[PDB]
Design a protein around this ligand. Structure first.
Ligand SMILES: CC(C)(C)c1cc(NC(=O)Nc2ccc(-c3cn4c(n3)sc3cc(OCCN5CCOCC5)ccc34)cc2)no1
Length: 270
């Protein structure tokens, strides 16, 4: 974090766009930011009113080195001096993809376009050797165009409140989005996020349905995944797309396809 420091006085807060237990994300008007253009809309990541502060700091350290990508929420600046730590991001108008799709409850191409950009964005993370711990529809944002951006509501989401996060250790985790090796062996590779992508792929073509509908997370649930159980075809998906999901749902971690291949898989469908 060398040149990313932005004046806190040139920042004008607005309404809160989602608050966690210890942190919040708000809308803001930034003066003198891009071309020093008329003040634009930005997303500011912050903490609500100590040990947790360091968690946000490393998140900022990650952004500056990861570089800017079209399908990843871009870092525009930061405020680390004289006050609470601020993280200025690119503002997304339509919010998360999860709430955006149930709101729809737009063509089939747009569903493919979303998945393509997500897989293309994930490729950029694999190239940088980075593993997304919570890849889902609730962690991807949509902007003014047909483009989607990958993000992480760490400290931004009250994981205690969301039903998706179940207690299986000393912290909640998205069970229905995790790979088998992560479930019982706690192994997290980039091919584990491929599994998460498959689950993500489902809720995209199932329009924001919770995965494994009707069936809750219990002692029985873990046994199905261990038995190689996979989900049925979503309603708005075609046959070719479903084969990608079950490929991402291969029990053997090696068998799952690389995100590079996924970029090429969905791309050919234009
Ligand atoms: C993923 C990666 C790179 C590994 C990573 C992420 C990370 N850490 C993060 O990415 N943190 C993070 C958290 C939130 C945002 C964020 C949220 N929102 C925006 N950016 S824009 C926006 C707009 C919203 O809607 C407001 C009103 N709605 C508008 C549209 O209509 C309905 C209402 C709601 C939330 C929201 C960005 C980054 N650290 O590493």
């Amino acid at each position: 974090d060398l040149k990313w420091e932005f004046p806190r006085e040139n920042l004008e807060f607005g309404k809160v766009l989602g608050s966690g237990a210890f942190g919040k994300v708000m809308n803001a008007t930034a003066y003198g930011i891009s071309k020093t253009g008329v003040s634009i809309q930005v997303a500011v990541k912050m903490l609500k009113e100590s040990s947790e502060r360091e968690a946000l700091m490393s998140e900022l350290k990650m952004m500056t080195q990861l570089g800017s990508h079209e399908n990843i929420v871009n870092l525009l600046g930061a405020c680390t001096l004289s006050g609470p730590i601020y993280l200025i991001f690119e503002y997304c108008c339509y919010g998360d993809l999860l709430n955006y799709l149930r709101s729809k409850r737009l063509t089939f191409e747009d569903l493919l376009c979303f998945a393509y950009q997500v897989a293309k964005g994930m490729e950029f993370l694999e190239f940088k050797s980075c593993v997304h711990r919570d890849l889902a529809a609730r962690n991807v944002l949509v902007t003014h165009g047909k483009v989607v951006k990958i993000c992480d509501f760490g400290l931004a989401r009250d994981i205690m409140s969301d039903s998706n996060y179940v207690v299986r250790g000393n912290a909640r985790l998205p069970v229905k989005w995790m790979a088998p090796e992560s479930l019982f062996e706690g192994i997290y590779t980039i091919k584990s996020d491929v599994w998460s992508y498959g689950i993500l792929l489902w809720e995209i073509f199932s329009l924001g349905v919770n995965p494994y509908p009707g069936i809750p997370v219990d002692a029985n649930f873990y046994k199905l995944i261990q038995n190689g159980f996979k989900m049925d075809q979503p309603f708005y998906a075609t046959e070719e797309i479903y084969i990608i999901m079950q490929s991402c749902w291969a029990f053997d971690s090696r068998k799952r396809p690389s995100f590079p291949n996924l970029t090429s898989f969905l791309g050919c469908q234009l």
